[PDB]
Design an enzyme around this catalytic site. Sequence first.
Site, mmCIF file in Angstrom:
data_model
loop_
_atom_site.group_PDB
_atom_site.id
_atom_site.type_symbol
_atom_site.label_atom_id
_atom_site.label_comp_id
_atom_site.label_asym_id
_atom_site.label_seq_id
_atom_site.Cartn_x
_atom_site.Cartn_y
_atom_site.Cartn_z
ATOM 1 N N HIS A 190 22.513 72.610 13.239
ATOM 2 C CA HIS A 190 23.256 74.117 14.050
ATOM 3 C C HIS A 190 23.732 75.209 12.898
ATOM 4 O O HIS A 190 24.302 74.943 12.041
ATOM 5 C CB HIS A 190 24.518 73.603 14.855
ATOM 6 C CG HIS A 190 24.733 74.889 15.737
ATOM 7 N ND1 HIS A 190 23.057 75.265 16.877
ATOM 8 C CD2 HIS A 190 25.364 75.706 15.970
ATOM 9 C CE1 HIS A 190 23.471 76.711 16.875
ATOM 10 N NE2 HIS A 190 25.381 76.621 16.930
HETATM 11 C C1 LIG Z 1 32.215 80.002 8.892
HETATM 12 C C2 LIG Z 1 31.747 79.109 9.058
HETATM 13 C C3 LIG Z 1 30.531 78.559 9.025
HETATM 14 C C4 LIG Z 1 29.976 77.711 10.104
HETATM 15 N N1 LIG Z 1 28.944 77.255 9.958
HETATM 16 C C5 LIG Z 1 29.078 76.113 10.919
HETATM 17 C C6 LIG Z 1 27.242 76.080 11.087
HETATM 18 O O1 LIG Z 1 26.171 76.028 10.296
HETATM 19 N N2 LIG Z 1 26.878 74.615 11.729
HETATM 20 C C7 LIG Z 1 27.857 74.214 11.761
HETATM 21 O O2 LIG Z 1 27.676 72.813 12.697
HETATM 22 N N3 LIG Z 1 28.877 73.992 11.812
HETATM 23 C C8 LIG Z 1 29.614 75.332 11.320
HETATM 24 N N4 LIG Z 1 30.807 75.751 11.099
HETATM 25 C C9 LIG Z 1 31.702 75.014 11.878
HETATM 26 C C10 LIG Z 1 31.571 75.062 13.169
HETATM 27 O O3 LIG Z 1 31.972 76.738 13.763
HETATM 28 C C11 LIG Z 1 33.117 74.391 14.393
HETATM 29 O O4 LIG Z 1 32.455 73.189 13.563
HETATM 30 C C12 LIG Z 1 32.380 74.298 15.564
HETATM 31 O O5 LIG Z 1 32.684 75.223 16.187
HETATM 32 C C13 LIG Z 1 34.410 73.891 16.036
HETATM 33 O O6 LIG Z 1 34.324 73.571 17.405
HETATM 34 P P1 LIG Z 1 35.346 72.736 18.813
HETATM 35 O O7 LIG Z 1 35.248 72.801 19.745
HETATM 36 O O8 LIG Z 1 36.284 71.700 17.681
HETATM 37 O O9 LIG Z 1 35.744 74.659 18.619
HETATM 38 P P2 LIG Z 1 35.777 75.781 18.413
HETATM 39 O O10 LIG Z 1 34.692 76.167 18.347
HETATM 40 O O11 LIG Z 1 36.652 76.560 16.454
HETATM 41 O O12 LIG Z 1 36.947 76.217 19.449
HETATM 42 C C14 LIG Z 1 38.501 76.417 19.517
HETATM 43 C C15 LIG Z 1 38.440 77.500 20.524
HETATM 44 O O13 LIG Z 1 40.006 76.828 20.861
HETATM 45 C C16 LIG Z 1 40.257 78.515 21.111
HETATM 46 N N5 LIG Z 1 42.213 78.338 20.697
HETATM 47 C C17 LIG Z 1 42.513 78.248 19.607
HETATM 48 N N6 LIG Z 1 44.419 77.334 20.005
HETATM 49 C C18 LIG Z 1 43.843 77.846 20.866
HETATM 50 C C19 LIG Z 1 45.501 77.768 22.296
HETATM 51 N N7 LIG Z 1 46.155 77.642 21.488
HETATM 52 N N8 LIG Z 1 45.256 78.411 23.448
HETATM 53 C C20 LIG Z 1 43.584 78.445 23.925
HETATM 54 N N9 LIG Z 1 42.480 78.835 22.829
HETATM 55 C C21 LIG Z 1 42.768 78.421 20.998
HETATM 56 C C22 LIG Z 1 39.985 79.428 20.143
HETATM 57 O O14 LIG Z 1 40.540 80.844 20.281
HETATM 58 C C23 LIG Z 1 38.236 79.125 19.577
HETATM 59 O O15 LIG Z 1 38.007 79.620 20.691
HETATM 60 C C24 LIG Z 1 31.216 77.003 10.878
HETATM 61 C C25 LIG Z 1 32.527 77.423 10.921
HETATM 62 C C26 LIG Z 1 32.364 78.543 10.065
HETATM 63 C C27 LIG Z 1 33.849 79.081 10.034
#
Ligand SMILES: Cc1cc2nc3c(=O)[nH]c(=O)nc-3n(C[C@H](O)[C@H](O)[C@H](O)COP(=O)(O)OP(=O)(O)OC[C@H]3O[C@@H](n4cnc5c(N)ncnc54)[C@H](O)[C@@H]3O)c2cc1C
Lengths: 486, 483
Positions: free
Chosen positions: A459
């Site tokens: 992705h």
């Molecule tokens: C610059 C960058 C580029 C990336 N590029 C890629 C890529 O090309 N391909 C890829 O596969 N991955 C990529 N990643 C990694 C990917 O973004 C993450 O692995 C993924 O988003 C993690 O998903 P998740 O469900 O763990 O959390 P996230 O998608 O980060 O969701 C966490 C959410 O929880 C919320 N939150 C936090 N604390 C609280 C709280 N206490 N109460 C309520 N809400 C809260 C935040 O606002 C956020 O929306 C990238 C990351 C970054 C930083």
Amino acid sequence: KAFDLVVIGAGSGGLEAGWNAATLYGKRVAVVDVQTSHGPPFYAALGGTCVNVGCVPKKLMVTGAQYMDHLRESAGFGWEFDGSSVKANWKKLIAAKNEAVLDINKSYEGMFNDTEGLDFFLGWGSLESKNVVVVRETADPKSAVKERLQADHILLATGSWPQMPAIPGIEHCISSNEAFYLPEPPRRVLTVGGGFISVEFAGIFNAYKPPGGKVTLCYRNNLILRGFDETIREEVTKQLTANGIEIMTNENPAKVSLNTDGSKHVTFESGKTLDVDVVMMAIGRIPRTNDLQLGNVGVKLTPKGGVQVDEFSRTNVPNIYAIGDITDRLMLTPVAINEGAALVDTVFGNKPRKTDHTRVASAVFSIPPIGTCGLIEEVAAKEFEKVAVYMSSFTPLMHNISGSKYKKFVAKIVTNHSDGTVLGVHLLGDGAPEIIQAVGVCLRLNAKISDFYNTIGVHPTSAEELCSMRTPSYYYVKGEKMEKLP
Amino acid sequence: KAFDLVVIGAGSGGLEAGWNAATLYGKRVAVVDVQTSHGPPFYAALGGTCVNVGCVPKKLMVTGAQYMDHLRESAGFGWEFDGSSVKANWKKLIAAKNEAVLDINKSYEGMFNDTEGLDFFLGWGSLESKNVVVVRETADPKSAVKERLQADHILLATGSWPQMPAIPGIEHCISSNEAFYLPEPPRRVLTVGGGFISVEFAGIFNAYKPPGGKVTLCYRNNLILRGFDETIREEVTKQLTANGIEIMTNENPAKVSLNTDGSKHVTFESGKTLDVDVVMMAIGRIPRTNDLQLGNVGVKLTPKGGVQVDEFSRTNVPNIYAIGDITDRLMLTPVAINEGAALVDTVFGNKPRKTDHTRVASAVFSIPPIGTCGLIEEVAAKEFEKVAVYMSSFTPLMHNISGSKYKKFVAKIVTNHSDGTVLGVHLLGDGAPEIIQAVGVCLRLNAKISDFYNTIGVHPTSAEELCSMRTPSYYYVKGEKME
Ligand SMILES: Cc1cc2nc3c(=O)[nH]c(=O)nc-3n(C[C@H](O)[C@H](O)[C@H](O)COP(=O)(O)OP(=O)(O)OC[C@H]3O[C@@H](n4cnc5c(N)ncnc54)[C@H](O)[C@@H]3O)c2cc1C
Ligand SMILES: Cc1cc2nc3c(=O)[nH]c(=O)nc-3n(C[C@H](O)[C@H](O)[C@H](O)COP(=O)(O)OP(=O)(O)OC[C@H]3O[C@@H](n4cnc5c(N)ncnc54)[C@H](O)[C@@H]3O)c2cc1C
Ligand SMILES: CC(=O)Nc1ccncc1C
Ligand SMILES: [Br-]
Ligand SMILES: [Mg+2]
Ligand SMILES: [Mg+2]
């Protein structure tokens, strides 16, 4: 003058067999071709059709043509420049392509130099007898013998040649051969045919046309790209039309005459007319068997004209084999190469292997391009009781920003719904030819839809769409299309 | 209010889990996030990090950066235009990216509006008790209570957050979060880190830099992109350098101060100095557990601050699970998504399933890009007596003509030489992220090198290199490389 293997045609299939026999099995190999480098008079040369007047130069020219789209699309990402200064210098492109192809021709001369036993002979191969090939100065069998080669094994690998419809004024028309050497980009061009060559060249000419330019593609039947997925055929038609190409379907030239200014007056069978600077015929390619003098030894040809072969590329004549386009099956370089590699691993390796002509990955370097492997649903539906079709189709985000909203990405998986086995994968959009290659490996391994959807996506990519489809869009049940299973 | 499931974090994994539990298993689901759309002050928002300040916007911006190469490369194919009229309008890129991200924010808003049994709560989620999520006004646990959500089951899916080294001048540096909102493209920028985010942002800034600009990347270790194939690490270093990026390896910022004009004066541990307009720290991401008050329920954390999970994403507390970056395993959107689906299948479907974190296809949207799946040879060589490396490295033909002769395509297949099983495939060059996807499916099916070589090539492609390698380039025997 004595060889284990004599190959007629130093092309995709001929060189794979030649080089393999020599390097892998220390065999003594003769290879014949009519020319040592690209272009007029015989077009194909050392390297073959793909290298000289095929895949290689075509891909360079489509890459060149793609910049028309990139230059426009850049603006959506904030790129700014004087659009009124943009010129497409065809002459530069052809000089660059020529130099690139010549380097490959020389690369192959190097190979034949730096490799023991492997020797190149220049001139026209024909069959004297079961175990002697004669190299003459021309394709006339009454011309001078330059060499007379003794062969325990003969490989016919002479490829194909453009077919030119026998219409009044055909001598005013070109084939893809001459298209590669046009001194100026045509303002107005008619590409004749609905196959990959007509479509790819319509894209090329469309990008390089001078101002007030127009590309017309005509096809005798209702819908271009017979043999490809139907959704993609209709979509490519739309996307070519969106980029300024006029698609005349159910139309076919009846004659061409020269106008007094040297332009071509095309009369269609329907009575319509069109003036163009170039008429490029791309209606078919036919195997090159004539010049080999196959009558001499009685090699059987097919009801269509290709050398008849068994699964091991064996003719009716022992020690005589045929691979690639002369067999008039799938006219693709990697198939020719696969066949040559198999023939040699078989005969000299003592390791019999047969080319699999099913589940072959292939592409059309249309803009945007097609990548496909295996069966279209119509063909699947006639063989399997229950076929599922998984389809995802959308304009990718980058192309909403680019302003090319018409670039819908199409991903279709066709399965045997009884066991989930993937029968075919059909892609249209940027990167489709690159995406499809490892899909060919998946199909060889009898991948099911669940192997795709249980694999984790990369992705963000277009490719990850193939790993995101869990639920059929529709089915064929004993040939009958329907949204839901009974 | 009472829910079957409460999800803290409306992100890649949290939304997969909540949507699945609501729609496939008919559970009543609450999802909490701190913002309904992208950007300051909290950056991530409804949709998650990937949508708001990750994969989605960065891919759009790398696509934008690629036009710098296309514009130059067009000349080799005879394209002509006034080079001195060329401007990279960063403001237009950022505005285009912001609309794309806001549209996704809006669509997720509509998803919650339109999906019964799936409810969104705005604010800061934390654990009051093992069956109670408190939603508050701010990250401060003394801030006002907006909601108290009773939960049979609680999913922690709060993702990760940029790590900032406690150095003097840290306040004068930014992370990827702020990089996405720079109003103007920096003339001079230092990316700090050798990871994908530093490399990807170096390429973005290199394309959009104003005239006389300069992009510098710095990394403590000797070679960028640890974890990637070593040939690709070396080649991608060469190819960035060739496109005008200064790669400072074995260098780290000691401190940052402001020059009188407000520009950033960088002192490296080596005593080198650099003046830049922007310092972007991309040195690591840490799990976001601080604000969850997990001490209220005794959920087990690592010293790092990740939530410890079994292979089914279960914490030490029954009915509390964690998926995605908060688990500090593979920080990829599709992995978070896979873990959320597997969790909900297991818990609400009684369809027991655990995410395979091996043989995960991934990419780096460097210029040019990387696509990879499975083990690098050094790792394979420690776990297999005999390892074969199939390597092809060639400046493709479009790049003789384009003038980018430096752009070598690298294709490498690593096998268990005992049976031919492919352990790893590593690609560098245009198309690599697109090529590697279906390679993921090959490694799930235990493809061998013979399955690649016996597959017929698609020509001409870069991908066909994978199906053209008959013979190893070299081996590892008992961890030892042999030519
Ligand atoms: C610059 C960058 C580029 C990336 N590029 C890629 C890529 O090309 N391909 C890829 O596969 N991955 C990529 N990643 C990694 C990917 O973004 C993450 O692995 C993924 O988003 C993690 O998903 P998740 O469900 O763990 O959390 P996230 O998608 O980060 O969701 C966490 C959410 O929880 C919320 N939150 C936090 N604390 C609280 C709280 N206490 N109460 C309520 N809400 C809260 C935040 O606002 C956020 O929306 C990238 C990351 C970054 C930083
Ligand atoms: C415009 C165009 C585009 C194409 N694009 C693609 C593509 O993108 N991908 C793809 O896979 N395929 C493509 N093809 C098809 C591909 O070129 C052929 O399938 C392939 O070259 C067939 O290889 P072969 O070994 O049959 O013979 P060829 O490669 O055609 O080699 C035949 C050789 O035999 C020589 N020869 C002929 N008669 C004699 C004789 N009597 N004595 C001595 N030498 C002789 C010729 O000079 C020629 O060099 C394209 C074809 C064309 C025309
Ligand atoms: C990788 C592979 O399958 N190679 C191969 C194929 C056929 N014959 C010999 C070899 C070494
Ligand atoms: Br290192
Ligand atoms: Mg020789
Ligand atoms: Mg709802």
